[PDB]
Each structure stands twice: as structure tokens, then as C-alpha cells.
RNA sequence: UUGAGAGUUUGAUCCUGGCUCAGGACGAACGCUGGCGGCGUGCCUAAUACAUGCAAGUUGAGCGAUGAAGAUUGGUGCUUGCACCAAUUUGAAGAGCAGCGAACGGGUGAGUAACGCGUGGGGAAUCUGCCUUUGAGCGGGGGACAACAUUUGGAAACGAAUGCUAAUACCGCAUAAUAACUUUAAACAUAAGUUUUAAGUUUGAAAGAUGCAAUUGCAUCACUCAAAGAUGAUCCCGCGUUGUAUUAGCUAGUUGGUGAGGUAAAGGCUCACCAAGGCGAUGAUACAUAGCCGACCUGAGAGGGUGAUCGGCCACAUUGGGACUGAGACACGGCCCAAACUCCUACGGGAGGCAGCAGUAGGGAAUCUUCGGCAAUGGACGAAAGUCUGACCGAGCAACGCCGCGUGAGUGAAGAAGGUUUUCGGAUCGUAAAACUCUGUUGGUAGAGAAGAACGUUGGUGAGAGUGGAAAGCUCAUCAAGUGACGGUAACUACCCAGAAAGGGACGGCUAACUACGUGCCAGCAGCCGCGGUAAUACGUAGGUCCCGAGCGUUGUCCGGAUUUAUUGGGCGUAAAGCGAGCGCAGGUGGUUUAUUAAGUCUGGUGUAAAAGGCAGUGGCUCAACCAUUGUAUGCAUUGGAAACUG
RNA sequence: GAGGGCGCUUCCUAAGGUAAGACCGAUGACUGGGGUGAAGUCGUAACAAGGUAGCCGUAUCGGAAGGUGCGGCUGGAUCA
């Protein structure tokens, strides 16, 4: 209650706004058997990369369906 | 604390060796029931009688007595009564009392309790210091020239077993420990132990 | 009794000083000779005076060791 | 992640530490892992229980000794043993 | 993979799941005799090879789904219906 | 590894049999008395409500930036130096952008009746910064923005216009691929399957930091992210973890299958679709009640009983519910919503929750104090220094418990003066006793000292990696260096005068302690028998006594006795009791013998409380009590053997 | 152009209302039984073959102890 409100709102604001910059990055999903389109969809974990929250096994569970006919 | 002995001296007729003095005439409890007649007792009455003679003859309290007497009821080596009555000498006023210097144990408890006799580098304020055998008892010369001690305690006398009696320095060293072979009033574990220790 | 129970418990001793709207201590006590009771009252309490040198404890029923 | 600390265990004027390998999260009086040695600095004096083995286990894993614990290890030569592994 | 139990099934009708009876005699501290007790374990069927009389054995593994805790894989005991 | 009963239906006995009570323990109270010191402990109580302080910051080794420097030189006025030009940095708190714990520490048990608790397995469901430490670069440019411009609004609360820095911020984007998958073969592989290499994919930084200096390269770190350990978690299962069957039928995502979303993950974990099961009368649901465990009081034990305080787990944060962040929270001191209080409001709006430590008001049996600092640790950042911590350490409250000593001791006792009874004698004071001789427990005072409460982080020396490099720095082998709060602290000398410092309960028995004694079934006493109606050891009453002590006694709770649910350790003819008799359901029990089996059964290895606790020992606040230590002692488990019994 | 807050409906959805219960407590005019106390009053029963021995289960008539009857047993007699 000193500055940890700023610790809540600046973080939550900034990277939740990055998650707004992650929602349609996941979606807008055609099948697209394209190497570059799967570099996009595969790159979705790694699009901001320090506030991108490259997370443990998140790419893998987001590679179950994604790899499961990625095209 | 420091109560009289109409009970030891009168309700038994014997103030035993916590004081030692056989008292004079009129061995009843006087005032009322002094010129009057006797009474009787039971097995409760001599559980009672034995715990009060061994306890209240000496100068012991009952809190310290029954707590350290369950601590005399520790081991289970058959007859524990040697471990009971063996811890009748391990108080220091009894040790000087069996050096024969003090008239009663209450006298050595008094003028040992005052911090007069400095038993090995400590201003002695417990004469029920638990005694270990084969150790000396250092006695201060100021205590040796206390005129109450010069009147009675330094006024030397005979000496019991189980120690070494330095008459020149009024000291002692616990050689062996006295026991049922050594000391014998009517000590009964049924009476005192089966009066106190979970009456049984 | 706020818990719907006996309007009684025994006052020991000779006499009493209390009246209505007085806080009353509650001995857990029973007398067979006293019918319809479950409890007694602690006389020798904060609201109790008496006469000391009683041959039982000198100090119940509103008493003390006598300061002369 | 891993630490090594004392343990306050004693009287009003006779404390008694007891060295216990710990963490940043570890309660220094409550939850623990396992204590290694019992310590008393200035009575009578420089009194310590040492085994010099599980400190090597949790330095193979890597821990953080305290002030007099680390200086006790400099009074134990296992830091010179870290010169030896060095 | 690891552990083991044994007993008759109650319901040999379900798909990819089947229970087991338990005989286990465990102690009554007053009475002293170890007393039978029947726990139930509904779990895997391979091809739904369900028969009255047989005994399947468990696997301490991933549970299948809800209520299917082991994988009752191997039918070690096989009886015949009457 | 042990074992008593009392008084009671007794016209009289035994037995069944209940009622009585001693003993101990209390987070207890109360009448009295309350000595000292040491060791501890103390809203069990209304998850009541809170004015009143403190409870988590951090660095200027990134950055903006006021102030002090005047980093007083520049007319440094002429005041005989300086109002100033004020040289640009100790640039001043050196605000605020950045990181960290924010989930520490800490309480409170409201709820919670079983994967929560306490054991055992598993990731063939899994994660893990902070540490050890592997490959491993510290690419790559851009741009608004805290602060500052700054104009405002607003009662405040709180924002907004406004451009720009800075980044120890962000971000695209090649460079990172065993990470995941895209491959091609399979040793392996278990219903699922696990496992080596055989083709293609994502993207990194504080190009930072203080510096150092240099074979111009060397240290502390974040993404490069693995290479594991390590820690701390995740969920599933075995095990035991309350009462009510006057707690019967229960269950709708219920239970399977397929798919998808999620997750760290198999998993109706969810959700879609398609299937209809399943549970349960050998207790499922519904209701009450409960934080649980180690442990701990009592019982000889069997056990009963408790969960206080301590430690672990779980749960919670006025109430209820969501959700971001964060590696990790659905978060005492995050957010958002609602409600309930409260405060301010000019009524248009804002703000908060002591079940944190205090402390206040409630309510009682239940106050610890509205005290200091973090050195003695503990944590957090910070290169270090430093910083904060109502955690902790201590001081003060409570006889609230445990210990320990004591208020006198020794000689001297005559019944002595003295009290009381008194058949007139005898009798108290029982070893201060009426005197005498002394003494300093605790305290008197003077106080010498005054308790070590203490380790290097800071600098030097020297060693190692000797770090292309000796530099510098890092490892850690030395010295210098503060390690205060109880403080003149316990202890010790001078010890003062026996002078300052013992009372409480009890006497009809029931268990030991009865006569003066108004009484007169009177008033009262009492756990049981009871009593008191004229001399009551019952009571009021004095003396004598009986047991204890700074505690006595009282009830409130619990254990034992009680074998009074009798496994240990019952009975059923009449004293309580065999159904009102038959079946033939489960369930229980098994004629003999051959052999297997080792399931159970016995042996060996394996798990076991971090602990704390017992059986011992050690030291110590002396010695005390108890603390500190050190072992010992254990279905906590899993694995070889035994065919003697049962199966 | 992508993407982005807002732009923008729905899902779950905390609370509040609804209805028709069930549970559980409190509560209640009058009223049924039981226990306690008087020592009123009614009565002879139950106790001896206790004055008709009973004692049961049951039906039925009494103010009430109780009776009558169905059947059974001595925890019943003089001894049948």
C-alpha cells in the first residue's frame, strides 16, 4: 500500500496490454500449411520475449493442436 | 518454616537426628490434652507418623520432599529403599551434622545457608546441596570464627561414619554413603512411599 | 437464569445483605436437605461482609484474617 | 535458494544457537530441513558440534552460511578445500 | 505399472472401466482378528473383454479419467462363467 | 509393567447393584495470606467493532532532476573583499522512471467430517528464479513516456491536455537448433507404450554495470537456457483420520466414449457431441459437530481424555465472488465488483477494514505495556556500505504455574510471668524459648568491580584460481577494526541489627487433631452417613491440636478407582436379561489325511517423529527445578527365508 | 494493411427478488399425562389361602382403587 499499487497497475496494465497483443496473435487462425505462417503461429510464444511470458511447456501445449495439423 | 517440635518431641517422644535431642518431661501435647490421656493410631496413623518423623524431624519441606522423593522413587532395581534412605545424607547440613559440629541440622543449615562456609567457590545459599561422595567441603575461616559457631559448631564433638573429619578446618569428605546397614530409624517405604507416592 | 432453569440456589450463612439487581456468584453445590436445588451461592464474595475468627477458615461468609 | 544459519535456543541470558541448513523461505525457528551441529560462541568458549560432511553436500548443492557459520568454515578449512577443488 | 490388487468385478458391463472386490483382512484393535473388507476400483478395460469370474490387475499410472484411478490392464486370473 | 477404599437399601448377612470419595493435572477463578530470586507461561473467551503507534523495501555501480557546493576562478562590489560574477560537482532528502521480496515475517481456527490431516509410492501427469553451475552471447535498431515541460479541472479525492529525456524499461527483427515440433530408422517399448540417431522451424541481452587496466583483455549479474543437482511446490492412489440408519433409496455431467479448450500436466480438469449408467442397507446421500497430526494430562498398563502454548500441514483474511500480474497469490496490509459499517461531502463524489504486534471499546475467570533497538540473529534488496523487521532479542504486568532459600540459629524448659482447661493439682511456650551467645538466606547501606552476552562484512598483509594478465578484482589462510538493551546486570567485599521478611486450611466420623462452648431441630454446618430439640469434638464460640506453604482451601473441567459395556477385564434360572417359536439369505465357524502355496503367520534388509518428547549421560541460569547437549529407545517401511498352524 | 484500447453482443456470473416446500429453534389461549408436597375427602383392595391368591395378553363395564369373562402359569395356598 506504499507503491505496490503501482507495482500492480503498471505491470498488469503493460503486459495485459501485451496479452491484447497476444490474443489475435494466437487467433486469426486459418489452417495455412505455410512455413512462414507456422513461423508466425509457432512464434506466438516468442513475440515480445521479455514481457512475452515465454512459459514452461506453454509452447508445447500450444503445439499439441498447433502441431496437430499445423497446416 | 522453622516450626517447633511438639510433634516430633511430643507426639513421638523422640526428636530424632534432624535435631537429635530427647526432650524432657511432659511428653504429651500440652496446654489442652497435656494432663489428659493418650490416643491411638492406625496404618494410616503410621504412614502419617513415619512421614512426619522422617520429614518433619529434619527440616525438609513437603514440596521439595515429595518432588525430590518421587525423584527418590525413580529407579526400579527391586528394593528402592536404599535409594530412598541413601538420599537422607546428601544434604550438606546433614553432612556437617554427621561431622558432629552443628548441634542440629538446622544449625548447619542456618550458618551454612548464610554464605559463611564457602564450599568450593560459591556463596552457599542451599544447605540441601546434593552431595556427591569423595569431595571436600571448603570451610571459610570467618565462619570458623563466628561466635555462634565458636560456641557450638567449632565446639568440636564426635563424628559419624562415611566421611573424613578435618577437626582443624572443620571439614569433611563423603567416603561411602550411609544406608540401612548404617542408619536405622523405623524407615518404611510402605509408610512414606505408600503415604505419598500414589498411595498404593 | 437466562437459560430457563431454577429460580433458586442456596445462600449459606446467617443473614445476607443483597437485594434485587445484585450480581450473584454461583457455587456449584448440592444439598439433599434442600429441595429443588442444583446450585449454591458463593457467600464470602465481593458483595459479602461477615464476622471473622470463624472456626472454619475465619474468612468465608464475608470475612478476612482480622486486622485486629 | 539454499542457506545455512544458526538457531536461537536458550535462556534469557544463556542463549544457544544450533546450525541448520535452510533457505530464504525457511523459518529460522519453525519449519526446517535438518540441523547440522549445535553452537555456543562465548561460553565456554568457541563451543561447536561439527561434522564437515553435509556442509559439503549442501555446497555441492550450494548453500549460504551465516556470519559465524562462514567464519566457522574458515575455522574449518573446507573453504581451503574449495581452494582444493579450485 | 507398479502395484497390484485382485478380486471379482461387480459390474462386467461398462466400457473401459470395471471394478474389483477386495478380500483384505485388517485388524480390529479390540477384537484382534483381521477382518475382510471390500474396496472397489473401477478402471481400464482393454477391449471390454468382461467376464463373470475373471480377475484383472491394476497399474499405478496416469488415471484414465474421472473415477478410473489405476489402469486395470492385465487379466491374470481367468475363470469360466459357471 | 502394575492394582487399597470409604459411607451407603443394613431387624441381621451375602450377592447383583447404583450412589459417595481420596490422587493428580488445569492458558481457571474466588475468601485469606500475598517475601525474595531464578525458570517458564497467560482473550481456552464475541473470525465483536476499532480513533491510538509500528509492522517490506532497496539501491544515485542506469537515469531525469531541485538544493548545497558557492565545488568562489571569472568586476570574485570595495563593505577593506565578497551583495555578486555565483568554476561545476561532496552534484543536497539527492524526489520519480528500474528490481527484488510483493506468496516474507506474523497471527486466527471462523469454517472445514475428507486426498484436508499423518505415513507410502509416482510423475509411465509435473514446475521451480532466488543457490551450486552447462553450452552461452551479452546482436539488433526504433519509439511515447514517469520526472520535467506543463495547462487545468475538481469541495476534496483524484485525474486530464502538453512534448521530451532516461532506462540497471519496452519492442520488431537475422544470430539460439538436443527447448517444442517439423525428420527418417529403430536397439527398447508396457492397455497405454518408453527410448538413440538418421530432414526441416521460433527467437537473446543491462553491445549494460562498476571498474580494471592491458599477450587490451579480467571479475558481480537477465533475457542466451540449459547441464544436472538442489530447494520449494503440483496432483493421483494405499493406509487410519466424529455422531445421528427415528442419518433410504441416492445420483443429471451423474457415469462411460469421442473431440476440443486448458494445465506444469493424463484427467467432464472443463466444454461440445454420442452413449445410461453408477452408488447404496457390510451405511450412499442429508443433519449436527470437528481444524488435523506429532504431541500432551491421567490411568500400572490397556487405555481414557485434550489438541493448549511448541513444531508440521490445512484453512482464513468485515462479508461474498471474480480475475490480471507475479516462476509461484486468487494475495492480512494487490486490484475490481457487490453488500455492511464508518468518515468527509457545498450531496455533485471519495476512502477503509487490528483473526499482525501493540493498544482501545465491548464480554467474561481471562491484563501481558499504547517501552527500546535490531548489535544476538532472521529476511529483503543494495557491488559493498547501507537500509528496514511489534520477527526476534530484551525490559515492564499476572503467585498464573515450577523450583529454590527464608523470616532466625545454638545453649538454656521451670510449667515457667503468660494464656487456657481445671476434680484446683497439672498443663501450653519444646529449644528465639523469659532470658543468654552469636549470625547475615532474602533484603540494609557503601559500593570495588560493574557479565563474556561480540562474528566479520571495513582496510592491510600473505596463499590459491594464479584468473592471455602480476594487474585490479575474486576465492578466504592473518592482523587492525565497532561488535550493548537488560548495566555498574547476576556474581563479590564491607553485612546491618535478630533486627525488615511465613500464614492458610482442617478437628463427629468419612482419614489422623477434642474440651470451655450461647445453644436447644435454634440459628447454622455438610461430598456420603448427616446433623443441632439443654451441657453438640458436627454448629457460633476460645484453647489445644491435624496437614501444608508463599501458597492454603473452594468449586468449574478431565482421568483413575469404575471390571460402571467387563478384548485385556462381564452377566443372562429367580436379583437386568434367552427373541414367541421355525426357516436357511448373507455372514460366521470348520471330520481326518497327501502335497503345493507363504496369503496371514515368524526371521533378516528397507521406510520412522527435521524436531521437540521418554531411558541414560553430560554441562549449566548455580546445585536448584528445569534448560542446553549427547546418544539410546519406534507396523511408520519394504524385502530373502520357514511349510509347523490357518487360509 | 496487421494488431491495438475503445469500438461491441453473448457466455458463466457475486448479490437481490420470486415460489413451494422441508428441517430446526423460539413461541402459544386452553389442554393431556407424570412427579412433588397435606396431614382433605372416596374406598378396599395388593400384601397371610391379606381377606374373591393371583400374574399375564386380550375384550369389556366401572369416580376410583377395581370388577366380569376368554385362555395360560405359580412368581399359590389347607394341601388338594
UniProtKB/Swiss-Prot annotation, chain A:
**Biological-process GO terms, alphabetical:** translation
**SUPFAM superfamilies per the record?**
Ribosomal protein S20
The protein's matches in NCBIfam families, at most eight in alphabetical order, are given as: S20
Q: Which residues form a coiled coil?
A: none
Pull one GO CC term from this UniProt entry. cytosol
Q: Top-down, what is the taxonomic lineage of the species of origin? A: Bacteria, Bacillati, Bacillota, Bacilli, Lactobacillales
Tell me the function of this protein.
Binds directly to 16S ribosomal RNA.
**Annotated family:** Belongs to the bacterial ribosomal protein bS20 family.
Keywords, ordered alphabetically: Ribonucleoprotein, Ribosomal protein, RNA-binding, rRNA-binding
State a single Gene Ontology molecular function.
Answer: small ribosomal subunit rRNA binding
Top-level taxonomic group: Bacteria
This one is known as Small ribosomal subunit protein bS20
UniProtKB/Swiss-Prot annotation, chain B:
Q: Which gene encodes it?
A: rpsD
The record's annotation in Gene3D superfamilies points to:
Ribosomal Protein S4 Delta 41, Chain A, domain 1 (1.10.1050.10), RNA-binding S4 domain (3.10.290.10)
Kindly list the residue ranges recorded as spanning the membrane: none
Give the keywords, sorted. Answer: Ribonucleoprotein, Ribosomal protein, RNA-binding, rRNA-binding
Q: Which PROSITE patterns match?
A: RIBOSOMAL_S4 (PS00632), S4 (PS50889)
Q: Name one GO cellular component term.
A: small ribosomal subunit
Name of the featured protein: Small ribosomal subunit protein uS4
- Looking at the record, the residues that make up the S4 RNA-binding domain are 90-153
Q: Tell me the classification of the organism that encodes this protein.
A: Bacteria, Bacillati, Bacillota, Bacilli, Lactobacillales
Any idea what job this protein has?
One of the primary rRNA binding proteins, it binds directly to 16S rRNA where it nucleates assembly of the body of the 30S subunit. With S5 and S12 plays an important role in translational accuracy.
Give the matching SUPFAM superfamilies.
Alpha-L RNA-binding motif
From Swiss-Prot, chain C:
Tell me which residues bear 3-methylthioaspartic acid.
33
Please give the family membership noted in the entry.
Belongs to the universal ribosomal protein uS12 family.
Task: Tell me the function of this protein.
Answer: With S4 and S5 plays an important role in translational accuracy.
Quaternary structure and interacting proteins, as annotated = Part of the 30S ribosomal subunit. Contacts proteins S8 and S17. May interact with IF1 in the 30S initiation complex.
Q: How is this protein named in the record?
A: Small ribosomal subunit protein uS12
State start and end of the fragment within the whole protein: 70 to 137 of 137
Swiss-Prot record, chain D:
Q: A GO BP term, please?
A: translation
Instruction: Tell whether Acetylation is among the UniProt keywords.
Output: no
Molecular function per GO: structural constituent of ribosome
Q: Which Pfam families match?
A: Ribosomal_S16 (PF00886)
Question: Could you state one GO cellular component term attached to this entry?
Answer: cytoplasm
Keywords, alphabetical: Ribonucleoprotein, Ribosomal protein
* Stored NCBIfam families: S16
Q: Tell me which family the UniProt entry assigns to this protein.
A: Belongs to the bacterial ribosomal protein bS16 family.
* This protein's name: Small ribosomal subunit protein bS16
